[PDB]
Write a protein that binds this ligand. Structure first.
Ligand SMILES: NC(=O)c1c[n+]([C@@H]2O[C@H](COP(=O)([O-])OP(=O)(O)OC[C@H]3O[C@@H](n4cnc5c(N)ncnc54)[C@H](O)[C@@H]3O)[C@@H](O)[C@H]2O)ccc1C(=O)c1ccncc1
Ligand SMILES: NC(=O)c1c[n+]([C@@H]2O[C@H](COP(=O)([O-])OP(=O)(O)OC[C@H]3O[C@@H](n4cnc5c(N)ncnc54)[C@H](O)[C@@H]3O)[C@@H](O)[C@H]2O)ccc1C(=O)c1ccncc1
Ligand SMILES: NC(=O)c1c[n+]([C@@H]2O[C@H](COP(=O)([O-])OP(=O)(O)OC[C@H]3O[C@@H](n4cnc5c(N)ncnc54)[C@H](O)[C@@H]3O)[C@@H](O)[C@H]2O)ccc1C(=O)c1ccncc1
Ligand SMILES: NC(=O)c1c[n+]([C@@H]2O[C@H](COP(=O)([O-])OP(=O)(O)OC[C@H]3O[C@@H](n4cnc5c(N)ncnc54)[C@H](O)[C@@H]3O)[C@@H](O)[C@H]2O)ccc1C(=O)c1ccncc1
Lengths: 268, 268, 268, 268
């Protein structure tokens, strides 16, 4: 009766109703999870977005670069879920890389300050969140972050791909920490999804050549995917995150599950 | 109401009540799947074993090297599940390598005839089974085979590790075929499990040095696994197979899920 | 004065003057290696081909499926190189998969007998050759086999890709044996090369669709390769084999060096 | 006559005579390369160290976090090698992670400022150096960085492992840039080497438990390495860097060569 029946799951990374985290949250609630959400910066916006979720969920502010937000997280969530209750699940669906960065836009021209910001928010924050939240997670718990496969370089994604490589590496370390809590840590490597930001990129936000490359990447995905890939549909990835949040992948950690249509297994 | 509520799933590879497939079957039935089982050679034995499953399941003979069994499979299962019904799930949990082979017992001394037999039953049969069964599988279906991680060589498992490397490669091709049917094909790379055969090996069936090496491998697994590994417990791997059989990994194919405690992500 | 100055190196796999092994041999001789060659089946042809090598080299018959050839190899080479001399280098450049097999031509329709033959010649023979030859190899020696990257499935190459997956796995085991002799074992994963057989395939020998797929694969290689890929030029791969045969990769074994233009590192 | 006969090669990362870069430089000079060296911070020390090299080499200051050093590099090297001469080779042998960081010393307790510094010097600087130097590199050129395998998490190395994951990812992007110059970019993943810093760690500089873990890691390396691993001997890795700097790996880029005794191919 619900994949996630009775689980308390924190879901970060909702910014629009096309956010992967929005779908993760929706599916998680459809599957009986009780949610706490974290949002960055535009919390009035995020509350209005998340009102459309099948169930209400407390929305907490988390700027993953903050420190004080991080320090007060755990307390703020236990307050939201009630004293003596702990998280069963944590979803990191946070990513950012300054344009600079990420297209466009010579790889070599991204200032380290921008790269570092990107890696902070996209990779290091996975350890941050796990640090903040593991003290309030139950044995049998699950931390899941959003990834894409960075094992091979690719056009446009540039330093974001590096940030994913760092994230994957971080996840493997987080798994070592999380294990002491009976908690799993895994990533979901998604195929490309037409999120608002992503649509804006294919639309040229970051230069025509970046857009053209992403579109090429999207098409080759689908072709390569033995079961196809629908970049307009985040549900299969939400479902995969929910599988990791459930008790049905109980021996998997420090790992990456590829919700990418099988594209990464193919080549051509 | 059951991860696998209403799914018809064929499960090969039951030979004892400590078989990984036995646990896969049990968990699958606990989760509402309707099963057809295939067994090799000792079908009276296998029926008696499988009587202990929470639900009855037709037991069909399948010797994966046979050809005629393969040719008549599909027909024999549609007969068992009823005309107009198709499989949603297929579990390959079949492995064999002649001792020779697999310890012991110099890698170089395994005759190709023995290796070939091993690869036939352990790798090629995954394509065989998919060939036989995909014509009687539903869109949204799932084929799952049992794997262990062969990306690095290891003591004792010798040609069986090669057979797993071939199996993984076969799986990626099977995924291409299965996709045309809306069907996923994936492997579960398990940590070591104290199956009867495996206990017999650690007990010295294949030489003292093979046994000692497997025991060393088992211990290092557990240590490496951020969440530990219990070689006496096949349930976490059955559960993982069930996750792949469910609709909750819908964008994963040609892939390997590691139900190994996270050990392969670690090193030390 | 010659990368391979003074090394005695056995090179299998010459069948035409466009054979990768022909280029390996030529470059090896240019670099001061003394060669023994092995050839399969058409030894009059192979002698005539190899007369074009910058230096003479004894040509020995080796049918890698034979057993007696294998058993008498070592003796036949020590005879060719002189009593008390041993090999420093061994090149396996042997591959075969029955059409059936390898295009075309449904993956599922390849009979196991054909697959097994393919794996025998393409994967198992690497262990065979190492078994035969390690007793007559010097410490500091190097065994190198020809590979292509099978980590992702691909059109057309079908069971040959599986045979490469098995070969890579075999190589890792061969490395364990070879190490006891102070000998390295590595593979070179080449990009596609317009060998006679390969040109015949792109020309349609194995069906129009196989040809079209290989041509697509060849083009995408080159595009993906950060330094490009020239399928008409086997020299960069011969050179790479020679690097593995030299003393300049002394801490590398059980490994794969990708002489593929960097294509496998890229994606798009 | 010298693997690197006539090549002009810049070698960063010499700080002591046990530095991997010192051995890279020595071997490179033994092989006929003309060197320019870069050193960080303690240039009087570094000059005194490098006086022991078989040949003199101009020593240029490079603090890879500086910007002005980076901007003036290229000009300073062309000055050292003479107008109208360009580099054939670049060696990045630069790594740093604040203790914090790297033992000890909870993974979660490393402040992002420290991690970011580590990633700056250890990963991002590979792109920095390539940016600075590719404009003064010849076609057929080679950039090589020092890596260790971060694909699996490990004790003690903590954020340095993450920095290596980022470095590997950066290398793949650098390969895309370098290719436009006819230049290869590759990494050498070394086994552990008893550098001064490393000896200080195993000696307990970073806590007893970090030391014990590194020693365990070192022992398991050697055991796993089919040809053994000698942590006191940096020569096999210098040689491997020299192989990448030569013309003998001409079709390899965006790649990693494992000079680790074959340990990463093994498991147990
Ligand atoms: N196509 C995609 O949309 C895609 C997205 N993901 C990951 O999915 C996760 C969610 O991204 P999305 O839903 O696409 O985009 P989104 O913009 O909806 O969500 C990103 C979230 O990060 C949040 N965030 C930014 N900065 C901070 C901060 N300082 N503190 C807290 N939160 C912050 C932000 O508020 C937003 O809610 C990110 O980790 C992505 O990298 C992973 C892979 C893919 C796909 O990129 C991909 C790419 C290349 N090859 C294959 C597939
Ligand atoms: N420890 C293990 O038990 C282990 C087992 N698996 C896989 O799990 C699957 C089931 O094995 P098990 O349950 O351990 O052993 P089992 O003996 O219970 O089952 C093997 C089944 O294969 C069947 N079989 C043999 N020949 C034929 C044939 N010709 N036709 C049809 N069926 C046939 C046989 O009847 C039996 O039912 C096999 O693919 C294994 O390789 C995968 C990984 C691991 C583990 O090996 C491992 C090993 C090395 N590193 C890490 C983990
Ligand atoms: N494009 C290619 O030509 C290619 C070739 N290789 C390998 O290079 C090696 C040499 O092949 P080639 O030079 O292309 O072809 P070839 O036909 O010149 O050589 C194959 C050799 O195998 C020999 N052989 C066959 N059967 C036996 C036997 N029973 N005993 C002894 N010898 C036998 C045969 O006589 C011939 O000399 C093989 O292992 C290939 O698989 C590896 C990779 C690639 C390339 O296939 C590739 C493919 C897919 N993606 C990327 C790259
Ligand atoms: N054992 C090791 O010594 C080891 C070393 N490497 C790499 O080899 C490279 C050289 O390290 P080493 O020779 O061991 O140590 P080293 O201290 O001799 O050299 C590091 C150099 O970095 C320089 N550096 C630091 N900061 C800056 C800066 N801001 N600007 C310019 N230069 C700077 C520093 O001056 C020094 O010359 C580094 O990239 C290492 O990470 C790679 C792998 C291994 C080995 O770490 C390893 C580790 C884990 N598993 C397996 C193997």
């Amino acid at each position: 009766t619900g994949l996630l029946d009775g689980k308390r799951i924190l879901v970060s990374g909702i910014i629009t109703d096309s956010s992967i985290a929005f779908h993760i949250a929706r599916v998680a609630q459809e599957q009986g999870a009780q949610l706490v959400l974290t949002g960055f910066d535009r919390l009035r916006l995020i509350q209005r977005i998340t009102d459309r979720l099948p169930a209400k969920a407390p929305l907490l502010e988390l700027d993953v670069q903050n420190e004080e937000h991080l320090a007060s997280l755990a307390g703020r969530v236990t307050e939201a879920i009630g004293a003596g209750n702990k998280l069963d699940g944590v979803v990191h669906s946070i990513g950012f890389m300054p344009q600079t960065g990420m297209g466009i836009n010579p790889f070599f021209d991204a200032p380290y300050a921008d790269v570092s910001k990107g890696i902070h928010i996209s990779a290091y924050s996975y350890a941050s969140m796990a640090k903040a939240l593991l003290p309030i997670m139950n044995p049998g718990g699950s931390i899941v972050g959003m990834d894409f496969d960075p094992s091979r370089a690719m056009p446009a994604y540039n330093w974001m791909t590096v940030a994913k490589s760092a994230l994957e590496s971080v996840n493997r370390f987080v798994a070592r920490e999380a294990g002491k809590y009976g908690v799993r840590s895994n990533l979901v490597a998604a195929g490309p999804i037409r999120t608002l930001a992503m649509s804006a990129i294919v639309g040229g936000a970051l230069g025509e050549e970046a857009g053209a490359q992403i579109q090429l990447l999207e098409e080759g995905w689908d072709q390569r995917a033995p079961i196809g890939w629908n970049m307009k549909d985040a549900t299969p990835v939400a479902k995969t995150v929910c599988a990791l949040l459930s008790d049905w992948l109980p021996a998997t950690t420090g790992d990456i599950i590829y919700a990418d249509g099988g594209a990464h297994t193919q080549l051509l």
